[PDB]
Scaffold this active site. Structure first.
Site, mmCIF file in Angstrom:
data_model
loop_
_atom_site.group_PDB
_atom_site.id
_atom_site.type_symbol
_atom_site.label_atom_id
_atom_site.label_comp_id
_atom_site.label_asym_id
_atom_site.label_seq_id
_atom_site.Cartn_x
_atom_site.Cartn_y
_atom_site.Cartn_z
ATOM 1 C CG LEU A 15 -2.349 -0.640 1.120
ATOM 2 C CD1 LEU A 15 -2.468 -1.732 0.062
ATOM 3 C CD2 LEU A 15 -2.824 -1.168 2.449
ATOM 4 N N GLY A 16 2.159 1.100 0.424
ATOM 5 C CA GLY A 16 3.174 2.153 0.459
ATOM 6 C C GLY A 16 4.205 1.991 1.563
ATOM 7 C CB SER A 17 7.342 3.795 2.243
ATOM 8 N N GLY A 21 8.790 1.437 7.759
ATOM 9 C CA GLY A 21 8.870 0.394 6.754
ATOM 10 C C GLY A 21 7.746 0.492 5.749
ATOM 11 C CE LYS A 40 2.384 2.222 11.181
ATOM 12 N NZ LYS A 40 2.351 3.045 12.422
ATOM 13 C CG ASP A 125 2.809 11.289 14.040
ATOM 14 O OD1 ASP A 125 2.854 12.451 13.577
ATOM 15 O OD2 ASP A 125 3.337 10.311 13.477
HETATM 16 C C1 LIG Z 1 1.387 3.806 3.205
HETATM 17 N N1 LIG Z 1 0.024 4.001 2.742
HETATM 18 C C2 LIG Z 1 -1.029 3.580 3.437
HETATM 19 O O1 LIG Z 1 -0.987 3.306 4.636
HETATM 20 C C3 LIG Z 1 -2.258 3.322 2.658
HETATM 21 N N2 LIG Z 1 -2.292 3.543 1.295
HETATM 22 C C4 LIG Z 1 -3.474 3.146 0.873
HETATM 23 C C5 LIG Z 1 -3.956 3.243 -0.528
HETATM 24 N N3 LIG Z 1 -4.208 2.600 1.903
HETATM 25 C C6 LIG Z 1 -5.466 2.015 1.929
HETATM 26 C C7 LIG Z 1 -5.947 1.490 3.074
HETATM 27 C C8 LIG Z 1 -5.151 1.552 4.320
HETATM 28 N N4 LIG Z 1 -5.793 1.022 5.454
HETATM 29 C C9 LIG Z 1 -5.383 0.993 6.779
HETATM 30 N N5 LIG Z 1 -6.284 0.472 7.629
HETATM 31 C C10 LIG Z 1 -5.867 0.335 8.897
HETATM 32 C C11 LIG Z 1 -4.648 0.783 9.355
HETATM 33 C C12 LIG Z 1 -3.813 1.349 8.387
HETATM 34 N N6 LIG Z 1 -2.625 2.046 8.758
HETATM 35 C C13 LIG Z 1 -1.755 2.687 7.946
HETATM 36 C C14 LIG Z 1 -0.799 3.223 8.755
HETATM 37 N N7 LIG Z 1 0.315 3.939 8.499
HETATM 38 C C15 LIG Z 1 0.513 4.743 7.297
HETATM 39 C C16 LIG Z 1 1.942 5.285 7.236
HETATM 40 C C17 LIG Z 1 2.124 6.139 6.000
HETATM 41 O O2 LIG Z 1 1.153 7.207 5.951
HETATM 42 C C18 LIG Z 1 -0.193 6.685 5.943
HETATM 43 C C19 LIG Z 1 -0.515 5.885 7.199
HETATM 44 N N8 LIG Z 1 -0.562 6.744 8.395
HETATM 45 C C20 LIG Z 1 -1.190 2.897 10.058
HETATM 46 N N9 LIG Z 1 -2.324 2.220 10.074
HETATM 47 N N10 LIG Z 1 -4.149 1.440 7.091
HETATM 48 C C21 LIG Z 1 -3.914 2.141 4.270
HETATM 49 C C22 LIG Z 1 -3.414 2.658 3.055
#
Ligand SMILES: CNC(=O)c1nc(C)n2ccc(Nc3nccc(-n4cc(N[C@@H]5CCOC[C@@H]5N)cn4)n3)cc12
Length: 267
Positions: A15-17, A21, A40, A125
């Site tokens: 989903l990305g960095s 990590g 994560k 944060d």
């Molecule tokens: C890196 N990109 C994404 O995280 C992202 N990209 C797309 C397209 N997503 C779709 C669904 C999703 N769902 C989802 N559900 C539950 C928990 C999470 N968590 C994501 C983080 N940490 C990230 C650190 C990077 O910045 C973004 C966040 N804070 C912590 N929890 N994530 C995430 C993402």
């Protein structure tokens, strides 16, 4: 708490960095069903364990649920999937989301932060990138990596040495390294600005030093286009320099609850 890696299916494409990590999509074979998860991945371990320790203690509809942890190829923090992803990216890609809908989402964040304040946890944060969307009308707070359980005798956490998102940090965080629910109130005001600006980064083109210099003069960011005056007033109140005079999340949530139902009444 500790999950069975054999029950965890991970997707090849990330989903990305995110500095810790990577974030991956997966599936965790539960008692009778399959659970879609966001993982994560560490690829520091002490920070992932402490983050998971915080999240395990939290039970609220507006805070992301941690399924558990898994020690395999790398350390993994397994969370319940909020499919629409980060609030900032979402709004950047969906600029026709109505104002009423933004009020609804930022109010949901304040409800999670009201709970967090009562639990005597400091998030440290609170940014729109750390708000995950379950649906267009359902927000949850994630990213508990800098989060602290406050001591039974203190209302603040004191950091011992300053890698800090200075644009979301209250003046006392900078000047005295003091983190409290009221400093999360400051970040929440920045988060409101980001959301009403449809995921635009705050303090555009400014250095952290120039941001501190501006706030010290008493200058604040302006009203984002289309943002109701009442919401920008709340934003400014979150940006009260004096910690004592700054409102807590019970006052912030109530201003939002009332204004949300007021806009719901008008509509
Ligand atoms: C890196 N990109 C994404 O995280 C992202 N990209 C797309 C397209 N997503 C779709 C669904 C999703 N769902 C989802 N559900 C539950 C928990 C999470 N968590 C994501 C983080 N940490 C990230 C650190 C990077 O910045 C973004 C966040 N804070 C912590 N929890 N994530 C995430 C993402």
């Amino acid at each position: 708490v500790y999950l069975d890696r054999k029950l965890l299916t991970l997707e090849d494409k990330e989903l990305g960095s995110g500095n810790f990590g990577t974030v991956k999509k997966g599936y965790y074979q539960m008692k009778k069903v399959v659970k879609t998860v966001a993982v994560k991945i560490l690829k520091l371990k002490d920070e992932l364990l402490a983050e998971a320790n915080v999240m395990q203690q939290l039970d609220n509809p507006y805070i992301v649920r941690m399924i558990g942890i898994c020690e395999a190829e790398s350390w993994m923090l397994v969370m319940e999937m909020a499919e629409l992803g980060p609030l900032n990216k979402y709004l950047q890609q969906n600029r026709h989301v109505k104002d009423k809908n933004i009020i609804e989402l930022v109010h949901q964040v304040s409800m999670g932060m009201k709970y967090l304040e009562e639990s005597n946890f400091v998030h440290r944060d609170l940014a729109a990138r750390n708000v995950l969307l379950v649906t267009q009308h359902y927000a949850k707070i994630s990213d508990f990596g800098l989060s602290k359980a406050l001591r039974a005798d203190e209302n603040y956490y004191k950091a011992q040495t300053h890698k800090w998102p200075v644009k979301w940090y209250a003046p006392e965080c900078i000047n005295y390294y003091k983190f409290s629910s009221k400093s999360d109130v400051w970040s929440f005001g920045v988060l409101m600005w980001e959301a009403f600006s449809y995921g635009q980064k705050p303090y555009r083109g400014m250095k952290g030093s120039e941001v501190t210099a501006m706030l010290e003069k008493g200058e604040r960011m302006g009203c984002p286009a289309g943002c109701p005056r009442e919401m920008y007033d709340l934003m400014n109140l979150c940006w009260t320099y004096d910690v004592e005079n700054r409102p807590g999340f019970a006052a912030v949530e109530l201003r939002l609850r009332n204004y949300y139902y007021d806009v719901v009444n008008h509509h």
